[PDB]
Amino acid sequence: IVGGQECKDGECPWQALLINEENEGFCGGTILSEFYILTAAHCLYQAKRFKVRVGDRNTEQEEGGEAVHEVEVVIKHNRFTKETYDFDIAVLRLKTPITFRMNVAPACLPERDWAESTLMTQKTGIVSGFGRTHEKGRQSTRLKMLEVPYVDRNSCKLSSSFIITQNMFCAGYDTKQEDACQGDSGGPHVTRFKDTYFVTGIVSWGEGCARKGKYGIYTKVTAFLKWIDRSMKT
Amino acid sequence: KLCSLDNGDCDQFCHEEQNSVVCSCARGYTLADNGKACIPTGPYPCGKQTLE
Ligand SMILES: O=C(N[C@H]1CCCC[C@H]1NC(=O)c1ccc2c(Cl)c[nH]c2c1)c1ccc(-n2ccccc2=O)cc1
């Protein structure tokens, strides 16, 4: 996350982190329930064997409220392809259930129609993660969150050097130096409605970070709610 | 305008059944007697920041 602010205690309890064999975070996730994590399909390529850490805010020292969970089943959307980055979505079934507490809570899944009519039409959404804080830099050790404006559908297609499919949406700033960055992928994009946060997007991709004239590209969660429901039952 | 007017006064989901507002809630919440508010069932309801 470039810009934005670090997540204070209990502000982003639904954030999940994918850690490889070397205990380092390479992607983000969203807690959906005690047994499921939502993330980007393209993240499944970035590592051979990975685990999921919840409740952490500072990668450096073991704070005391974090917990690591092993993945039981990886549910990758079969229509995903690095060629287009369309259908960038996956669901993770954890071996042991997440115990909720301070800094550890699921985000709500909205219903398609309402979400599109009420959440997606909001001015902003919140993205968060441990990604780079600058286009050139290391992964942040602190969890950050950033308010990103919803971006006009037509407007964003013009700005993109790639086809924006209907399974994707744009958020961010044209000029302002605030945007998601490398490492934030798979992370949560949530929309606030009356002090309740619903999962609306997944950090998918971006042509660089915070560049003028470019935007953040997220996977539209409303386009896969059904797929998500089937994935949480199987 | 029903749901188009302040989410039809619903805490969460708002639908229109037979030309009338119908409020619903996400898992872990129960619709309150007023059929508008969402009541969390546990200590950690989805979508709520943990501020204890
Ligand atoms: O992420 C890519 N490049 C990465 C490697 C090159 C340097 C920049 C890096 N950026 C990120 O990691 C990054 C991730 C999320 C977000 C969000 Cl939200 C906001 N800013 C960012 C930045 C990337 C991946 C796929 C496409 N692409 C799209 C369609 C078809 C083929 C294709 O390859 C383009 C760019």
Coordinates of C-alpha atoms and ligand atoms in Angstrom, one line a residue:
Chain A
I1 CA 0.0 0.0 0.0
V2 CA 1.4 3.3 -1.1
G3 CA 0.1 6.2 1.0
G4 CA -2.9 5.3 3.2
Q5 CA -2.5 4.7 6.9
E6 CA -1.5 1.7 9.0
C7 CA -4.4 -0.4 10.3
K8 CA -4.8 0.4 14.0
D9 CA -5.8 -2.2 16.5
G10 CA -8.9 -4.1 15.3
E11 CA -9.6 -2.0 12.3
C12 CA -8.9 -4.7 9.6
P13 CA -9.7 -8.0 11.4
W14 CA -10.6 -9.8 8.1
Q15 CA -7.1 -9.5 6.5
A16 CA -5.3 -12.7 5.8
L17 CA -1.7 -13.3 4.7
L18 CA -0.3 -16.0 2.6
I19 CA 3.2 -17.1 3.8
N20 CA 5.6 -19.4 2.0
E21 CA 8.1 -21.9 3.4
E22 CA 10.3 -19.0 4.6
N23 CA 7.4 -17.5 6.7
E24 CA 7.2 -14.5 4.4
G25 CA 4.0 -12.9 3.1
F26 CA 3.7 -12.9 -0.7
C27 CA -0.1 -12.3 -1.0
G28 CA -3.2 -11.2 0.9
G29 CA -6.5 -12.8 1.7
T30 CA -9.9 -12.1 3.2
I31 CA -11.4 -14.1 6.0
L32 CA -14.9 -15.2 5.0
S33 CA -15.6 -17.6 7.9
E34 CA -13.8 -19.8 10.4
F35 CA -13.0 -22.2 7.6
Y36 CA -12.6 -20.1 4.4
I37 CA -10.2 -17.5 3.0
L38 CA -10.9 -15.6 -0.2
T39 CA -7.9 -14.6 -2.4
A40 CA -6.7 -14.2 -6.0
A41 CA -6.2 -17.2 -8.2
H42 CA -2.9 -15.8 -9.6
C43 CA -1.5 -16.0 -6.1
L44 CA -1.6 -19.8 -6.3
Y45 CA 1.3 -19.6 -8.7
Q46 CA 3.6 -17.4 -6.6
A47 CA 4.3 -20.3 -4.2
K48 CA 4.7 -24.1 -4.0
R49 CA 3.5 -24.8 -0.5
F50 CA 1.9 -22.0 1.6
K51 CA 0.1 -21.4 4.9
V52 CA -2.3 -18.7 6.1
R53 CA -1.6 -16.3 8.9
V54 CA -4.4 -14.4 10.6
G55 CA -4.5 -11.6 13.2
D56 CA -1.1 -10.1 12.5
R57 CA -0.3 -6.4 12.1
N58 CA 3.5 -6.4 12.5
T59 CA 5.5 -9.0 10.6
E60 CA 8.7 -8.3 12.6
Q61 CA 7.8 -9.4 16.1
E62 CA 5.4 -12.2 17.1
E63 CA 2.8 -10.0 18.7
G64 CA 0.9 -12.8 20.4
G65 CA -2.5 -12.5 18.8
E66 CA -1.6 -14.1 15.4
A67 CA -2.2 -17.7 14.3
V68 CA -1.0 -19.8 11.4
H69 CA -3.4 -22.1 9.6
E70 CA -2.7 -24.9 7.1
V71 CA -4.7 -25.1 3.9
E72 CA -6.8 -28.3 3.5
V73 CA -8.3 -27.6 0.0
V74 CA -7.4 -25.0 -2.7
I75 CA -10.4 -24.1 -4.9
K76 CA -9.0 -22.3 -8.0
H77 CA -11.5 -20.9 -10.5
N78 CA -11.1 -23.0 -13.6
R79 CA -11.5 -20.1 -16.0
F80 CA -8.4 -18.2 -14.8
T81 CA -5.5 -17.7 -17.2
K82 CA -2.4 -15.5 -16.9
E83 CA -3.1 -14.5 -20.4
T84 CA -6.1 -12.3 -19.4
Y85 CA -6.0 -12.4 -15.6
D86 CA -9.8 -12.8 -15.9
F87 CA -11.5 -14.8 -13.2
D88 CA -8.7 -14.0 -10.7
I89 CA -10.3 -15.7 -7.8
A90 CA -9.8 -18.6 -5.4
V91 CA -11.1 -19.9 -2.2
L92 CA -9.1 -21.6 0.5
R93 CA -10.5 -24.3 2.9
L94 CA -8.4 -24.3 6.0
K95 CA -7.5 -27.5 8.0
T96 CA -8.3 -26.0 11.4
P97 CA -11.0 -23.3 12.1
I98 CA -10.0 -19.7 12.7
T99 CA -10.7 -18.6 16.3
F100 CA -12.1 -15.1 16.2
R101 CA -10.8 -12.4 18.6
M102 CA -9.3 -9.0 18.5
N103 CA -7.9 -8.4 15.0
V104 CA -9.4 -11.6 13.8
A105 CA -12.9 -11.4 12.3
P106 CA -14.6 -12.3 8.9
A107 CA -15.9 -9.7 6.4
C108 CA -19.6 -10.0 5.3
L109 CA -20.5 -11.4 1.9
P110 CA -23.2 -9.2 0.4
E111 CA -26.1 -10.3 -1.9
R112 CA -25.4 -9.6 -5.6
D113 CA -28.2 -7.1 -6.5
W114 CA -28.1 -5.1 -3.3
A115 CA -24.3 -5.0 -3.3
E116 CA -24.3 -3.7 -6.9
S117 CA -27.0 -1.2 -6.2
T118 CA -25.8 0.0 -2.8
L119 CA -22.2 -0.9 -2.2
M120 CA -20.6 -0.5 -5.7
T121 CA -22.4 2.8 -6.1
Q122 CA -20.6 4.2 -3.0
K123 CA -17.9 6.8 -3.4
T124 CA -15.2 4.7 -1.9
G125 CA -13.9 1.3 -0.7
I126 CA -11.0 0.2 1.5
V127 CA -8.1 -1.9 0.4
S128 CA -5.4 -3.2 2.7
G129 CA -2.3 -5.3 2.9
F130 CA 1.4 -5.8 3.6
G131 CA 2.5 -4.9 0.1
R132 CA 5.2 -2.4 -0.9
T133 CA 4.7 1.1 0.3
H134 CA 6.6 2.4 -2.8
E135 CA 6.8 1.1 -6.3
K136 CA 10.5 0.2 -5.6
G137 CA 10.9 -1.2 -2.1
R138 CA 10.4 -4.1 0.2
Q139 CA 7.2 -5.6 1.6
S140 CA 5.8 -3.5 4.4
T141 CA 6.1 -5.0 7.9
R142 CA 3.0 -3.1 9.0
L143 CA -0.5 -3.7 7.8
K144 CA -1.9 -0.7 6.0
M145 CA -5.3 0.3 4.7
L146 CA -6.3 2.9 2.0
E147 CA -9.5 4.6 1.0
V148 CA -9.8 4.3 -2.8
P149 CA -12.5 6.0 -4.8
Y150 CA -14.7 3.8 -7.1
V151 CA -13.6 4.5 -10.7
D152 CA -15.9 5.2 -13.6
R153 CA -16.3 2.0 -15.7
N154 CA -15.8 3.6 -19.1
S155 CA -13.2 5.9 -17.8
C156 CA -11.0 3.1 -16.5
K157 CA -11.2 1.0 -19.7
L158 CA -9.7 3.9 -21.6
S159 CA -6.8 4.1 -19.1
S160 CA -6.0 0.4 -19.3
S161 CA -3.5 -1.3 -21.6
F162 CA -5.4 -4.5 -21.1
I163 CA -9.0 -5.5 -21.6
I164 CA -11.0 -4.8 -18.5
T165 CA -13.5 -7.7 -18.3
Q166 CA -16.9 -7.6 -16.5
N167 CA -15.3 -9.7 -13.8
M168 CA -13.1 -6.7 -12.9
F169 CA -13.5 -3.1 -11.6
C170 CA -11.3 -0.1 -11.0
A171 CA -10.6 1.9 -7.9
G172 CA -8.0 4.4 -6.9
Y173 CA -6.6 7.8 -8.1
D174 CA -5.6 9.0 -11.5
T175 CA -2.9 11.3 -10.2
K176 CA -2.8 11.3 -6.3
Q177 CA 0.0 9.1 -5.0
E178 CA -2.1 6.5 -3.2
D179 CA -2.7 3.0 -4.5
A180 CA -2.2 -0.7 -3.8
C181 CA 1.1 -2.2 -4.7
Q182 CA 3.1 -5.4 -5.2
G183 CA 2.3 -7.9 -2.5
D184 CA -1.2 -6.6 -1.8
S185 CA -2.6 -9.0 -4.4
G186 CA -5.3 -11.4 -3.1
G187 CA -6.1 -8.9 -0.4
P188 CA -9.4 -7.4 0.6
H189 CA -11.4 -4.6 -0.9
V190 CA -14.3 -3.8 1.4
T191 CA -17.1 -1.3 1.3
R192 CA -18.5 0.2 4.4
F193 CA -22.2 0.5 4.9
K194 CA -23.6 1.7 8.3
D195 CA -20.5 0.6 10.2
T196 CA -20.5 -2.9 8.6
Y197 CA -17.9 -3.9 6.0
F198 CA -18.8 -6.1 3.1
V199 CA -16.2 -7.8 0.8
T200 CA -16.6 -6.2 -2.6
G201 CA -13.2 -6.9 -4.3
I202 CA -10.0 -8.8 -4.4
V203 CA -6.7 -7.1 -5.2
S204 CA -6.0 -8.3 -8.7
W205 CA -3.5 -6.3 -10.7
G206 CA -2.2 -2.9 -11.7
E207 CA 0.2 -1.4 -14.2
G208 CA 2.8 -0.3 -11.6
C209 CA 1.7 1.5 -8.5
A210 CA 0.1 4.9 -8.1
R211 CA 1.3 5.9 -11.6
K212 CA -0.4 9.0 -13.1
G213 CA -3.2 8.0 -15.4
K214 CA -3.5 4.4 -14.0
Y215 CA -5.8 2.7 -11.6
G216 CA -6.0 -0.4 -9.3
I217 CA -7.8 -3.4 -10.8
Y218 CA -9.9 -5.6 -8.5
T219 CA -11.9 -8.7 -9.1
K220 CA -15.6 -8.0 -8.8
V221 CA -16.9 -10.2 -5.9
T222 CA -20.5 -9.7 -6.9
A223 CA -19.8 -11.5 -10.2
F224 CA -18.7 -14.7 -8.2
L225 CA -21.0 -14.8 -5.2
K226 CA -22.7 -17.9 -6.5
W227 CA -19.3 -19.5 -7.3
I228 CA -18.1 -18.5 -3.8
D229 CA -21.2 -20.1 -2.2
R230 CA -20.6 -23.4 -4.0
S231 CA -16.9 -23.3 -3.1
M232 CA -17.7 -22.9 0.6
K233 CA -20.0 -25.9 0.6
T234 CA -17.7 -28.3 -1.4
Chain B
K1 CA -38.6 5.1 -3.5
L2 CA -38.6 2.1 -1.2
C3 CA -35.1 0.5 -1.3
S4 CA -33.9 3.5 -3.3
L5 CA -34.8 5.7 -0.3
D6 CA -32.1 5.4 2.4
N7 CA -31.8 1.6 1.8
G8 CA -35.5 1.4 2.8
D9 CA -34.4 2.0 6.4
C10 CA -32.7 -1.5 6.5
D11 CA -29.5 -2.1 8.5
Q12 CA -28.3 -4.4 5.8
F13 CA -29.9 -6.1 2.7
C14 CA -33.0 -4.4 1.2
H15 CA -35.3 -6.1 -1.2
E16 CA -38.7 -5.3 -2.8
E17 CA -41.4 -8.1 -2.5
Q18 CA -44.8 -7.3 -3.8
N19 CA -43.9 -3.6 -4.1
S20 CA -42.8 -3.2 -0.5
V21 CA -39.5 -3.0 1.5
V22 CA -38.1 -6.3 2.8
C23 CA -35.0 -6.2 5.0
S24 CA -32.6 -9.1 5.3
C25 CA -29.2 -9.8 7.0
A26 CA -25.9 -11.6 6.4
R27 CA -25.1 -14.8 8.2
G28 CA -24.5 -14.3 11.9
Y29 CA -27.2 -11.7 12.2
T30 CA -30.9 -12.0 13.0
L31 CA -33.5 -9.6 11.7
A32 CA -34.8 -7.6 14.6
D33 CA -38.5 -7.6 15.6
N34 CA -38.9 -4.3 13.7
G35 CA -37.9 -6.3 10.5
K36 CA -35.2 -3.6 9.8
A37 CA -32.3 -3.9 12.2
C38 CA -29.7 -6.7 12.1
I39 CA -28.8 -8.3 15.5
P40 CA -25.4 -10.0 15.8
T41 CA -25.6 -13.5 17.4
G42 CA -22.0 -13.8 18.5
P43 CA -19.0 -11.7 19.9
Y44 CA -17.5 -11.5 16.4
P45 CA -20.1 -10.8 13.7
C46 CA -18.9 -10.4 10.2
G47 CA -18.1 -6.9 8.9
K48 CA -17.5 -5.4 12.4
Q49 CA -14.1 -4.0 13.4
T50 CA -12.9 -5.6 16.6
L51 CA -12.8 -2.6 19.0
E52 CA -12.7 -4.0 22.5
Ligands
LIG1 O1 0.6 -6.8 -11.2 C1 1.1 -6.7 -12.3 N1 2.4 -6.4 -12.4 C2 3.3 -6.5 -11.3 C3 4.7 -6.9 -11.9 C4 5.2 -5.7 -12.7 C5 5.3 -4.4 -12.0 C6 4.0 -4.0 -11.4 C7 3.5 -5.2 -10.5 N2 2.2 -4.7 -9.9 C8 1.6 -5.4 -8.9 O2 2.0 -6.4 -8.4 C9 0.3 -4.8 -8.5 C10 -0.9 -5.7 -8.2 C11 -2.2 -5.1 -7.9 C12 -2.3 -3.7 -7.9 C13 -3.5 -2.8 -7.6 CL1 -5.1 -3.1 -7.2 C14 -3.0 -1.5 -7.8 N3 -1.6 -1.5 -8.2 C15 -1.2 -2.8 -8.2 C16 0.1 -3.4 -8.5 C17 0.3 -7.0 -13.5 C18 -0.2 -8.4 -13.6 C19 -1.1 -8.7 -14.7 C20 -1.3 -7.7 -15.8 N4 -2.1 -8.1 -16.9 C21 -3.4 -7.7 -17.0 C22 -4.2 -8.3 -18.1 C23 -3.6 -9.3 -19.0 C24 -2.3 -9.8 -18.9 C25 -1.5 -9.1 -17.7 O3 -0.3 -9.6 -17.5 C26 -0.7 -6.3 -15.6 C27 0.1 -6.0 -14.5

